[PDB]
């Protein structure tokens, strides 16, 4: 396309959308709102396996009268306890049921945007619906291994009848030998189908009404999603016009844009058109919040917490005006007196605001000598020290041979020489069954002999450290 720049590639794919007018955003928000309540409608007459609000009003048990908070919850359930008495009559799809449960929907429409409370009721069937799905997958991974059979008669009448296994009698009807080529495995089909039939027991309702109105419940959750998408896609110029005042502060342009878009996606989710204000006035807050939060979390090699960021910024703002006013830079005393903090903290803050230098920094007249060439390894031992360590080990091994073997084993155990660990008196006397005190006696013996001048001046040579 004759270009490889991704900022132009973005600003080009972003310009194929039109800006909205004051009525466009209102009637987009209206359908965003009514799809999410069409869903809440569809959740209404699902069986008691849902987490329905019977005692959610009691689970929790603008400051509204307690008598108002206790009473208006009695309207809905006062009609609901008598309404779904008709769950039995004429199957599961009775028309009085649709009429009065969409009258419960007439009641339901009153409400508007809410936290994940509503979410946790539709999840009430998530954990239950896909379950059903996956179980009828199991039957299939138990049929295809043994026999091959055309799927569009079987699964079609599977969708249709759901009364009993009598639809398998529709498999032999065409009189081809693939009818009962299956042998000794159909009880596994009956296994999984029977377990989902006891799932049907706990639900009490057949699958082709639950999935039937889930087909229309999925219409609301998609029709809200699509309107949210085209409410987001029409406002990207706002993000791009805000995020151009945060440049040269540690992030690149497209990073700031992709941080602003995640805030716009929340301003779209929290909007309320009834309050009468435009969309820009509410969205700018979330856009700026996202960009500001990402500048303080990224964009430093060594990360500083947010409270220290605000302290640094405040001290910069004070020193600017004191420099404009005095004509000089103020000493930390003149900053402590006005910032009203203890001077040691003002001295502590002033060290934390420096970014590490690159190891490729050219140092000299040329550019073949770098800063990283003159950096020395500090954790190495000098060879004079290695030789000294080995010579001292040999000298000690020679002096430890003069005195008794049993009387040197105790020194080896007591100072840990040639062993994996140091030991204590009682655990050494464990193997000697000698008293707590005799060990100390023989140690004061050995250490008294070992400094007699017939022996000491070979080891004394080392202690000039």
């Amino acid at each position: 396309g004759r270009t490889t720049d991704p900022v132009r590639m973005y600003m080009r794919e972003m310009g194929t959308v039109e800006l909205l007018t004051r009525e466009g955003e209102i009637d987009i928000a209206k359908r965003i709102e009514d799809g999410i309540n069409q869903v809440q409608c569809s959740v209404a007459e699902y069986p008691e396996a849902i987490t329905y609000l019977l005692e959610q009003y009691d689970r929790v048990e603008n400051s509204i009268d307690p008598e108002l908070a206790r009473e208006k919850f009695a309207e809905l359930r006062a009609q609901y306890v008598v309404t779904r008495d008709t769950i039995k009559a004429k199957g599961r799809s009775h028309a009085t049921a649709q009429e009065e449960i969409l009258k419960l929907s007439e009641v339901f429409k009153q409400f508007r945007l809410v936290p994940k409370q509503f979410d946790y009721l539709v999840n009430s069937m998530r954990v239950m619906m896909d379950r059903v799905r996956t179980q009828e997958r199991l039957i299939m991974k138990l049929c295809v291994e043994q026999c091959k059979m055309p799927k569009k008669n079987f699964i079609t009448l599977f969708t249709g009848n759901e009364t009993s296994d009598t639809w398998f009698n529709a498999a032999i009807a065409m009189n081809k030998p693939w009818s009962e080529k299956l042998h000794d495995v159909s009880e596994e089909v009956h296994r999984a189908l029977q377990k989902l039939q006891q799932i049907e027991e706990e639900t009490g309702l057949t699958i082709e009404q639950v999935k039937d109105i889930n087909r229309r419940m999925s219409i609301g959750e998609a029709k809200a999603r699509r309107a949210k998408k085209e409410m987001v896609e029409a406002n990207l110029r706002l993000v791009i016009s805000i995020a151009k005042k945060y440049t040269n502060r540690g992030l690149q342009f497209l990073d700031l844009i992709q941080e602003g878009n995640i805030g716009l996606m929340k301003a779209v989710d929290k909007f309320e058109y009834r309050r009468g204000y435009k969309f820009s006035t509410y969205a700018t807050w979330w856009i700026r919040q996202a960009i500001t939060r990402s500048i303080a979390d990224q964009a430093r090699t060594i990360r500083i917490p947010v409270h220290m960021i605000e302290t640094i910024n405040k001290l910069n703002r004070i020193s600017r005006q004191m420099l404009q006013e005095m004509g000089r830079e103020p000493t930390p005393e003149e900053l402590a007196e006005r910032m009203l903090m203890p001077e040691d903290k003002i001295r502590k803050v002033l060290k934390i605001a420096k970014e590490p230098i690159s190891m490729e920094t050219p140092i000299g007249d040329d550019e073949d000598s770098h800063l990283g060439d003159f950096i020395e390894d500090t954790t190495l031992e000098l060879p004079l020290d290695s030789a000294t360590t080995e010579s001292l080990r040999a000298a000690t091994h020679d002096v430890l041979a003069g005195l008794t073997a049993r009387e040197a084993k105790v020194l080896r155990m007591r100072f840990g020489i040639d062993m994996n660990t140091d030991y204590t008196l009682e655990e050494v006397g464990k193997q000697f069954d000698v008293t707590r005190e005799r060990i100390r006696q023989i140690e004061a013996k050995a250490l008294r002999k070992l400094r007699h001048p017939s022996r000491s001046e070979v080891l004394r040579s080392f202690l000039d450290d």
């Binding site: 001077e343 000690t396 020194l411 140091d422 400094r451 080392f462």
Partner: protein, 50 residues
């Protein structure tokens, strides 16, 4: 080290909390001192020589 621990046990000497970081003349150089200057921070005790 264990061996150096036994050395300290025998001859009784102990080290201390501070290390020597003094400024020295580099090798090969031999000169006469002609000037000294001391710069100390505001809020620090000035010393006899300063």
């Amino acid at each position: 080290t264990p061996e150096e621990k036994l050395l300290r046990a025998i001859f009784g000497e102990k080290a201390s909390d501070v290390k020597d970081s003094s400024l020295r003349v580099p090798n090969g150089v031999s000169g006469t001192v002609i000037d000294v200057q001391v710069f100390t921070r505001d809020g620090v005790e000035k010393d006899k020589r300063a």
